[PDB]
């Protein structure tokens, strides 16, 4: 069934699972035409497919050419997502295939279930968690590879960098969702927090800065302050 706060440690057990977020697959800019009508222009997108235990991120870049000449793109995007996740699973050795796939949006259930009929033993599940994976395009290195793609492309990342050398998966996921939630709530402020100190840099092979354990505690506090601040600004509290 559905994933929520009651069964949260399930994410970090030894059953391979993947989150799939489709919120950045079909992306557009809306603009006025010369005649004063409105039109959309697609930009490159991405499927966010994440193993929450290991940090492995399968970023399938969705190039705007896939929409050419297609209708009902928001519907098609869910089916294209499901097609690409099914292809990913089929590409993996049997012992690496997930036992469960958790979709962040319930509209993905039927598309994905239909594409995964060949895998009756892979459970397709919704979640009641509101996860901030739409903010993945606020991670500079992810946004860059997506926008620079000239063709469909799969890129593999570890979204935890090397954190698992020092902290558990549960703690790594909590840090990741805190960072992404902050970036979703106020991207400018969040990125300022992450970079305000030039002596801490992002390794070439990393996505986030090389904070010490003590610096992470400070950073994490500043992100909670940011989220509380914006919550007050928003609701006037």
């Amino acid at each position: 069934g559905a994933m929520n706060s009651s069964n949260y440690a399930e994410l970090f057990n030894n059953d391979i699972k993947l989150f799939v977020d489709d919120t950045n697959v079909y992306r557009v800019t809306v603009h006025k035409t010369f005649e004063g009508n409105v039109a959309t222009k697609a930009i490159n997108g991405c499927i966010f497919t994440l193993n929450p235990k290991t940090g492995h991120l399968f970023l399938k870049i969705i190039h705007t050419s896939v929409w050419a000449g297609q209708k009902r793109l928001s519907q098609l995007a869910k089916w294209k997502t499901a097609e690409e996740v099914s292809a990913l699973v089929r590409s993996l050795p049997k012992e690496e295939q997930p036992k469960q796939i958790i979709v962040t949006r319930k509209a993905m259930l039927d598309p994905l279930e239909v594409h995964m009929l060949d895998f009756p033993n892979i459970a397709i599940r919704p979640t009641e968690l509101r996860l901030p994976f739409s903010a993945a395009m606020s991670i500079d290195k992810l946004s860059d590879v997506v926008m620079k793609a000239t063709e469909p492309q799969m890129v593999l990342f570890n979204i935890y960098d090397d954190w698992l050398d020092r902290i558990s998966s549960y703690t790594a996921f909590s840090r990741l969702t805190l960072l992404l939630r902050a970036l979703k709530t106020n991207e400018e402020s969040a990125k300022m927090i992450l970079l305000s100190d030039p002596t801490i840099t992002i390794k070439s092979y990393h996505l986030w800065p090389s904070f010490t354990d003590e610096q992470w505690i400070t950073i994490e506090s500043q992100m909670r302050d940011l989220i509380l601040t914006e919550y007050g600004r928003k609701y006037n509290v």
């Binding site: 089916w79 097609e83 598309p111």
Partner: protein
């Protein structure tokens, strides 16, 4: 005009024949039903006064044999049987016609309801859905489960309707996932019509039989089957014009006949709203839409 004699009526029971019904009191001198129209299947069904649990009954065609009902005090039900001795059966049916101990099938001449509900229903196909080859008639009751229900338990007592499952490899061609799920024409026309049923008459016959078992016995798996077969057509963008027109007639008479008071339990809100208002065929079922909107505007 054929007859189904009854040896007696030892327990109080409501007896149905097709869409008609009448009450028989315990040990009342009742000896059966005469003037049954030749040319149609028929269903004779029972609800005991002392336990409305288990409605049960028998589908039969009087062209295939001479049938009678006899109460079995051990198994506690009215059983259909076949008399092989034609002389003896005709002799017995005459005695009773003479003593006027039979009710008459009460068909108004104007009235095509039963034909309209059984147009495509054939006894030979009933006997493949309800497997008991030693009898020419078929027993159904409220509790019997379908083969598809058993997959999700005694197979001898199951309803072997054709399994329809929209999220199945049978329904979905590899590489046409979105197309086949959103437009079920290939599942309807190639898999089901050409492949399994062979023609639309057999498809409609199973649809009509499923409805009638839903209505007369409150058989839940039958109701599921009826709606699935409707939904498969309504969810197909390419359906022969003659099938859509016939489906509209079939459903019209089903909705017309359905007891107003049973609509809450025999009609699936999701399927009907989808079929009449969202589906490819939302504008192709004019008669059905009109009767539904005038009889059951709540459900919609």
């Amino acid at each position: 005009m054929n007859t189904v004699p009854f040896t007696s009526a030892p327990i109080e029971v409501t007896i149905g024949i097709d869409q008609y019904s009448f009450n028989v009191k315990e040990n009342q001198p009742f000896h059966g039903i005469k003037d049954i129209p030749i040319g149609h299947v028929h269903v004779i069904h029972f609800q005991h006064a002392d336990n409305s649990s288990m409605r049960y009954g028998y589908w039969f065609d009087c062209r295939m044999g001479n049938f009678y009902i006899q109460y079995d005090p051990k198994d506690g039900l009215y059983k259909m049987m076949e008399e092989r001795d034609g002389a003896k059966f005709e002799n017995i049916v005459h005695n009773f016609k003479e003593r006027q101990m039979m009710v008459s099938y009460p068909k108004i001449d104007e009235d095509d309801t039963w034909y309209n509900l059984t147009e495509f229903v054939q006894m030979d196909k009933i006997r493949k859905i309800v497997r008991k080859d030693e009898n020419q008639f078929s027993y159904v009751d409220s509790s019997m489960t379908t083969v598809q229900e058993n997959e999700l338990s005694d197979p001898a007592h199951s309803l072997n309707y054709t399994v329809i499952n929209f999220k199945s490899r049978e329904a979905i061609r590899p590489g046409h996932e979105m197309e086949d799920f959103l437009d079920k024409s290939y599942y309807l026309n190639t898999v089901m019509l050409q492949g399994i049923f062979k023609n639309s008459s057999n498809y409609f016959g199973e649809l009509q039989f499923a409805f009638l078992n839903a209505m007369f016995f409150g058989n839940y798996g039958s109701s599921l089957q009826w709606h699935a077969m409707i939904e498969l057509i309504c969810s197909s963008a390419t359906v022969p014009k003659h099938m859509l027109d016939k489906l509209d007639e079939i459903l019209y008479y089903q909705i017309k006949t359905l007891p107003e008071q049973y609509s809450d339990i025999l009609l699936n809100e999701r399927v009907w709203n989808i079929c009449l208002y969202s589906s490819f065929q939302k504008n192709s079922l004019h008669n059905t839409e009109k009767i539904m909107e005038n009889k059951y505007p709540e459900l919609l």
